[PDB]
């Protein structure tokens, strides 16, 4: 059936099917691998927010913070960078508390940009598959139909039984192409929406911490 | 009808049907909840708009609104978020009547944006369902057509019995795709229109109150 | 083979084929140039960023920069502009640290925007080619089908054998359209990703440099 | 031949085809017409902008504009309107020059909007044609096939072999519909993109002239 058509198809059709299958496998692997990381990050962020709003003194949680040096991620690293920059630049220069807040905010923005750019790898690869795959499938179908009807026209006797398998071998290509194209774009749309939520949570935490720092600077 | 040809269908058809049925159920539930939520919001907004020009002095209205504290929705949140701000800005800076109006306008715009973002939820899901639904039916139809062509090319002088499965599968896939597609688009359009109407009403109220404030601050 | 099919085509079909072939050649040339330019830019930026944190004082860095200040590009150009603006604002006009920070930020922003504008070019042509190519092929196929019906009506025969030659040119137009379409889209996406990565690297460097400058003052 | 098949088709199919051909003729006429006007406007604006930076005294430019006050278009009209508003409001004992600058900007914006509205006519017809064209052909094809099957089922002596030409005539409708649809859809986007550039040029010239006027007061 399908295997017989694959065996009897031209070399170009087989190559196109192999390319499309490889794209589908890569897309599935990327989606599966990327789905878990965002959930883990969200859980860690929520746990850290709960710990921060637990009324514990900042000194104790900072004394616990340095233990995972070069191992923090998410809101922990952001908080560590901001607090360390604030403390260092305050104990160095006391000319202006607003300068201290501004320096803390700049360090915070740098760290947040690095974290978000770390969380957004391999997502843009999914758009290319969705944009490209139907074109390759249609090219295969066009070539197959052209060859089949040229062969049909090579004979002055016309019957569709002889040329029926060629059209099926042509349409297999577009079927596989669209099958590989659909889930890629469907998941690409969903994954992008999750990054915005983490961006919003980080921004809210950043505003809260900046307000707290501004309150504490004048003391 | 549906059950017999579904039994006659292949595994891929069954998976497609299950996916599309789940999508339809989710769409229906979202529509049912969102319609009621928006109706309640609209009636509350209309009631508050009616109450604002009952001749009651603004102080009594502010005191009444203080009873619910921060548990306010509709146009009521707009008045609270901004009357106190105007009062405090005027008290702090009485020498800049052209700045209290700017501050009040900015605060009211921010609150309105917050409320508008609150009232729109799960609508992009409906848009995604409407945009993606037809292509799965297209894939099903392509599979059915290629199966029918295979059947035609298999045995010469075929009967009408052996070409039935492909046509049945293609028609089922197309019907289910359209059935899942239509309500999503209709509800998308209707909900967008209702949200636009609510936004227009909020803009009108904000403009009227800003005009009243500017008139008051003139002297 | 292909020559016979091209010769048997009508006038409009030949014009469409020529247009599509020209588009293909232009797209390939643009891709070939841009790949080399972008790779060289990325290598230079990476090398200079590696050199910066080595422990070299800013004074001798500025001294070395003026030697080839005529051809300074990318991160080197940004560093030159920032240091020059910082020095100029320290000994001219008001000496408030806020003014110096604002002026340095504006100068760095202007230089970065100019460089980014310099790197990305001729890409919108690729996007337009990718967006427009299939429609011309569909137009050619439609014209071929109309021609085939007219020719079939001219003769008294209704056999599918007579209809069969009326499909080759129509399919060839679509094949050429797709062949021109695919590489343009692929290159468009890849080049956009590379330019975004370079922009992110430049922004990180400028923020780090601004933080370094603001600390001393 | 062609006429025999045309007459064999039902009246509705022929009417639809004639309507589509007329639509194509009108669309091509508009597309040909607008391009000359747009190119002439672009070249005139570029030439006037070039002449304005040569250092000629502004009074001489104002006199040259006043010579053909009823024949000023493009960038010339905006300059004349702004200068007239600036001079006329200046003799009104305006204490604050900021009021004069604001009035000049307002008059220039009014004239710019009028000129852009003048340029932007006759375009949306193309969008309507592109959006409507395929549906008429699809309706023609559906009607043809419906009546073909009705005739086949009415008389048992008929066969698909005899009914065959009707289906081909029905498909010609969809072919012609797409043929008329595509070019208008392309040209709509092309012309809107071209108008946006003139808008940007006018905006930047507006800003430059406003700054020059304000600095001299």
């Amino acid at each position: 059936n399908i295997l017989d058509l694959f065996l009897k198809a031209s070399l170009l059709v087989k190559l196109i099917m192999l390319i499309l299958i490889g794209f589908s496998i890569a897309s599935w692997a990327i989606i599966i691998q990327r789905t878990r990381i965002l959930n883990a990050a969200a859980r860690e962020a929520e746990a850290f927010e709960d710990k921060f709003w637990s009324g514990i003194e900042l000194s104790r949680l900072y004394q616990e913070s340095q233990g995972k040096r070069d191992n923090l991620t998410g809101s922990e690293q952001i908080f560590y960078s901001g607090f360390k920059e604030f403390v260092r630049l305050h104990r160095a220069n006391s000319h202006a508390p607003e300068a201290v807040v501004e320096g803390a905010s700049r360090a915070m923005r740098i760290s947040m940009n690095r974290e978000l750019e770390n969380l957004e790898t391999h997502i843009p690869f999914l758009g290319t598959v969705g944009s490209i795959s139907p074109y390759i499938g249609l090219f295969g179908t066009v070539w197959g139909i052209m060859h089949a009807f040229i062969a049909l026209g090579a004979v002055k006797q016309a019957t569709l039984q002889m040329v029926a398998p060629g059209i099926a071998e042509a349409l297999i290509a577009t079927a596989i192409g669209l099958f590989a194209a659909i889930p890629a774009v469907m998941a690409y749309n969903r994954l992008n929406q999750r990054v915005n939520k983490l961006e919003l949570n980080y921004d809210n935490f950043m505003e809260e911490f900046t307000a707290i720092l501004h309150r504490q600077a004048f003391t | 009808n549906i059950l017999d040809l579904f039994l006659k269908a292949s595994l891929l058809v069954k998976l497609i049907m299950l996916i599309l049925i789940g999508f339809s159920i989710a769409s229906w539930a979202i529509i049912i909840q969102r319609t009621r939520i928006l109706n309640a919001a609209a009636r509350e907004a209309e009631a508050f708009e009616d109450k604002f020009w009952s001749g009651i002095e603004l102080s009594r209205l502010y005191q009444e609104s203080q009873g619910k504290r921060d548990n306010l929705t509709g146009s009521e949140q707009i008045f609270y978020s901004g009357f106190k701000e105007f009062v405090r800005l005027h008290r702090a800076n009485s020498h800049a009547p052209e700045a209290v109006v700017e501050g009040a306008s900015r605060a009211m715009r921010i609150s309105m944006n917050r409320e508008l973002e609150n009232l729109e939820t799960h609508i992009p899901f409906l848009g995604t369902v409407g945009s993606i639904s037809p292509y799965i039916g297209l894939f099903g139809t392509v599979w059915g057509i290629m199966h029918a062509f295979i059947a035609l090319g298999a045995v010469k002088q075929a009967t009408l019995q052996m070409v039935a499965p492909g046509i049945a599968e293609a028609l089922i896939a197309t019907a289910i795709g359209l059935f899942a597609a239509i309500p999503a688009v209709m509800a998308y359009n209707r909900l967008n229109q209702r949200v636009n109407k609510l936004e227009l009403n909020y803009d009108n109220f904000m403009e009227e109150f800003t005009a009243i404030l500017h008139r008051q601050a003139f002297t | 083979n292909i020559l016979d099919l091209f010769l048997k085509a009508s006038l409009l079909v030949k014009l469409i084929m020529l247009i599509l072939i020209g588009f293909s050649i232009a797209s390939w040339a643009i891709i070939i140039q841009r790949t080399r330019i972008l790779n060289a830019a990325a290598r230079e930026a990476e090398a200079f960023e590696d050199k910066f944190w080595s422990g070299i004082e800013l004074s001798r860095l500025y001294q070395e920069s003026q030697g080839k200040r005529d051809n300074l590009t990318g991160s080197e150009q940004i560093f030159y502009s920032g240091f020059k603006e910082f020095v100029r604002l320290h000994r001219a006009n008001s000496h408030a640290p806020e003014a110096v920070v604002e002026g340095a930020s504006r100068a760095m922003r202007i230089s970065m925007n100019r460089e980014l504008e310099n790197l990305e070019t001729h890409i919108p042509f690729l996007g337009t080619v990718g967006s427009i190519s299939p429609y011309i092929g569909l137009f050619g196929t439609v014209w071929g089908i109309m021609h085939a019906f007219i020719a079939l009506g001219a003769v008294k025969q209704a056999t599918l054998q007579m209809v069969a030659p009326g499909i080759a040119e129509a399919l060839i137009a679509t094949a050429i359209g797709l062949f021109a379409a695919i590489p343009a889209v692929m290159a468009y996406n890849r080049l956009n990703q590379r330019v975004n990565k370079l922009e992110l690297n430049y922004d990180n460097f400028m923020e780090e440099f601004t933080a370094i400058l603001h600390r001393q003052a | 031949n062609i006429l025999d098949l045309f007459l064999k088709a039902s009246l509705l199919v022929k009417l639809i085809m004639l309507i589509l051909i007329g639509f194509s003729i009108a669309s091509w006429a508009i597309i040909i017409q607008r391009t000359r006007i747009l190119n002439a406007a672009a070249r005139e604006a570029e030439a006037f902008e070039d002449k304005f930076w040569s250092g000629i005294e502004l009074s001489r430019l104002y006199q040259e504009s006043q010579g053909k006050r009823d024949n000023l278009t493009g960038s010339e009209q905006i300059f004349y309107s702004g200068f007239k508003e600036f001079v006329r409001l200046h003799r009104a004992n305006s204490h604050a020059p900021e009021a004069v600058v604001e009035g000049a900007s307002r008059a220039m914006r009014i004239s710019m909007n009028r000129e852009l509205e003048n340029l932007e006519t006759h375009i949306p017809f193309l969008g309507t044609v592109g959006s409507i064209s395929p549906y008429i052909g699809l309706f023609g094809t559906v009607w043809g096939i419906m009546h073909a099957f009705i005739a086949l089922g009415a008389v048992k002596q008929a066969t698909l072999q005899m009914v065959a030409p009707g289906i081909a005539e029905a498909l010609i409708a969809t072919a012609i519909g797409l043929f008329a649809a595509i070019p208008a859809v392309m040209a709509y986007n092309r012309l809107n993109q071209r108008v946006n550039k003139l808008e940007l040029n006018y905006d930047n010239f507006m800003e430059e002239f406003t700054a020059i006027l304000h600095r001299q007061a």
Partner: peptide, 25 residues
Amino acid sequence: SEINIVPLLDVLLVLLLIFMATAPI
């Protein structure tokens, strides 16, 4: 991204032009 299946109209039209005259040999 987006799914564009524009060049599929040619395939369907070509196929439709053939079943009409496929009965004669």
